[PDB]
């Protein structure tokens, strides 16, 4: 629905469509342009097969295919390897075991991908109405259900390393014998002074133990006396071990080591290099930026429990609130079309023998009988006309009790979660993609 959008906000959306982070589980948008499939396919993140045969083995680590000719090819799926910006490049598997394959057919989705189609976020049930100022100046309110079901949760893999270098005084050493330290600090480390795999870390945790070769130590009078009283030996070797930088958290997922004397080559001086992967699962929390396709972007300001959501007639809560004051001034009414079409897509429609102009247009287009949840396509400049939206809305399948739950106006009855009184007038509700 770009045609109904001010260019300024379309520019904002297009610039904000290159920054969506993938999530644990990707889902294709319910409403969106029909070109997304090609955009996903041409990008190299997806893994497609070069032959048309029958898959022989389907495993997360690898997928084996055998063409009728006889060539066997095993695609290795990258798993949880750091990207350029530090997001997982996890890759799923879609094809079954015995299913026939065609050349170029998608075998495994990439990040932010689903069934070979682009999926840069998820789709939320959403309603337009102010709410106690917790959506003032276009701040956002989202239900705790997103905190509950990892609907918006993203992996983050950080990698940082340390180097053993032969300085003028001597060589640096990696070891579990760090000097001038407690015992428990070096608890989970390895034999050679490396953190094990799986050991969670916090700020100050020791990842790899490194010690300076030596240094000219003129021990001070006060320190001299202190050592004499406690009978401890200050040794020229000095601690230079790696520590987590302040304000961090994560589980170690992989560790790599390269060594000079070993067959691996290193730059001059550096004797050993160690890289550590620390990974976390950041859940959607206060302060996380968030934005719709049309450019409505805000910082989450509060996450109420599932009850305080202004819930709807059948008890479905709303998963996000939005400040309506935006959409007039920003001159970007595409999103109201989008939300209505999303509600339409969630609840299927049946149109047969209606003899209406819009009904005739769908029948000739063929999009007449639609089951609930099946996706839809609205090309950028040949999208759905408002008349089509109105007719389809008037002919939505009854979700429950044989009643259509949204009024023909596109507004429905909201029951305040906290007060319980039904809201004085209906409110607009639908399903919009969010990133």
């Amino acid at each position: 629905f770009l045609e109904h959008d001010d260019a300024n906000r379309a520019l904002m959306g297009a610039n904000m469509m290159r920054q969506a982070v993938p999530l644990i589980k990707s889902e294709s948008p319910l409403v969106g342009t029909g070109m997304e499939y090609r955009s996903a396919a041409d990008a190299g993140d997806v893994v497609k097969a070069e032959k048309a045969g029958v898959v022989q083995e389907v495993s997360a680590d690898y997928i084996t295919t055998t063409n009728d000719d006889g060539t066997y090819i095993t695609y290795r799926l990258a798993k949880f390897s750091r990207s350029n910006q530090g997001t997982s490049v996890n890759q799923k598997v879609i094809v079954a075991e015995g299913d026939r394959i065609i050349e170029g057919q998608v075998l495994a989705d990439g990040p932010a991908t689903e069934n070979g189609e682009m999926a840069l976020g998820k789709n939320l049930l959403v309603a337009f109405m102010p709410w106690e100022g917790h959506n003032y100046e276009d701040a956002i309110i989202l239900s705790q259900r997103l905190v509950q079901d990892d609907v918006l949760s993203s992996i983050h893999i950080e990698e940082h390393e340390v180097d053993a270098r032969d300085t003028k005084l001597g060589p640096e050493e990696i070891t579990r014998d760090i000097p001038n330290v407690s015992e428990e600090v070096l608890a989970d480390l390895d034999e050679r002074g490396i953190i094990r795999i799986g050991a969670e870390v916090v700020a100050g945790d020791i990842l790899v133990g490194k010690v300076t070769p030596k240094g000219e130590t003129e021990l001070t009078p006060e320190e001299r006396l202190l050592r004499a009283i406690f009978g401890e030996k200050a040794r020229e070797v000095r601690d230079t071990s790696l520590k987590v930088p302040h304000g961090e958290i994560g589980k170690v997922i992989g560790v790599r080591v390269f060594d000079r004397e070993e067959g691996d080559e290193l730059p001059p001086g550096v004797n050993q290099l160690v890289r550590v992967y620390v990974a976390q699962k950041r859940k959607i929390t206060d302060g996380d930026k968030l934005a719709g396709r049309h450019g409505n972007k805000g910082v989450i300001s509060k996450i109420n429990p599932i009850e305080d959501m202004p819930f709807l007639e059948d008890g479905t809560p709303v998963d996000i609130i939005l400040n309506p004051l935006a959409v007039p001034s920003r001159m970007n009414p595409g999103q109201v079309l989008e939300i209505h079409l999303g509600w339409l897509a969630s609840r299927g429609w049946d149109v047969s023998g209606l003899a209406e102009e819009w009904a005739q247009r769908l029948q000739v287009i063929g999009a007449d009988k639609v089951e609930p949840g099946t996706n839809v396509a609205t090309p950028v400049f040949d999208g759905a006309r408002e008349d089509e939206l109105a007719g389809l809305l008037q002919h939505t399948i009854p979700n429950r009790d044989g009643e259509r739950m949204v009024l023909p106006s596109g507004k429905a009855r909201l029951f305040d979660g906290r007060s319980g009184e039904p809201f004085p007038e209906p409110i607009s509700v639908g399903y919009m993609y969010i990133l």
């Binding site: 495993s59 094990r196 969670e200 599932i306 009850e307």
Partner: protein
């Protein structure tokens, strides 16, 4: 002027959904009554859920188990919505073991006595002919939501991993009001509260517990006065 005390009646629409009607309610009460009932039922309700698991040959949730197309994290998401009922207040241990090619299921899981899964048809993952799944589960009981971050207590057992869990087995609640046939200006409203819940527990006992909680709170409010 007329005095009429509330009267509750029940009806069942599905094996796990029921509608409960209270007609004598004062005007402009059924809404607040239904709201408090709904919120309390969702907020608090005893329940059981898996709380932390262990996988042989795996040291973190990020890696993958050979033999499954599903990575470990996919298994986390599969189990988080697994629904269980546990009678024991203290943690219990459950085991999932599967070999050969085929689907792994909740039914396949080894149930300890007094701990019962309630969604056997749920599929958790699939194994190849070469695959092997071995899994330890911890079944704890609680209420509401508990994230894995506060659910971690063992640091030495790196094999163990926490999982955020959901206890409340109620799915959704919806209340409606009407007008009573009684001839008067007040026009007493008729509240009807429909509750649908997961397979763990019947809605009747769920709202029995909710009433227990709320009546406790208001007994606290009243008795402490006068």
């Amino acid at each position: 002027l007329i005095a009429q005390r509330p009267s509750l009646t029940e009806e069942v629409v599905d094996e796990f959904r029921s509608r409960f009607v209270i007609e004598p309610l004062e005007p402009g009460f059924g809404y607040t009554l239904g709201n408090s009932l709904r919120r309390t039922l969702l907020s608090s309700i005893p329940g059981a859920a898996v709380t932390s698991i262990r996988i042989d040959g795996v040291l973190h949730e990020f890696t993958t188990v050979p033999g499954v197309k599903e990575d470990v994290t996919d298994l986390i998401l599969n189990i988080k919505q697994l629904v269980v009922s546990s009678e024991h207040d203290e943690p219990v241990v459950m085991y999932l073991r599967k070999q050969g090619p085929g689907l792994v299921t909740a039914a396949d899981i080894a149930p300890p006595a007094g701990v019962e899964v309630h969604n056997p048809d749920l599929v958790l993952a699939t194994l190849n002919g070469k695959g092997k799944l071995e899994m330890e589960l911890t079944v704890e009981r609680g209420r509401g939501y508990v994230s894995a971050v506060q659910n971690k207590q063992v640091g030495q057992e790196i094999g163990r991993i926490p999982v955020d869990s959901i206890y409340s087995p109620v799915l959704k609640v919806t209340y409606k009001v009407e007008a009573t046939r009684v001839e008067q200006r007040t026009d007493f409203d008729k509240l009807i509260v429909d509750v649908e819940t997961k397979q763990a527990m019947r809605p009747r006992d769920a709202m029995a517990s909710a009433g227990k909680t709320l009546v406790e709170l208001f007994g606290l409010a009243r008795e402490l006065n006068i």
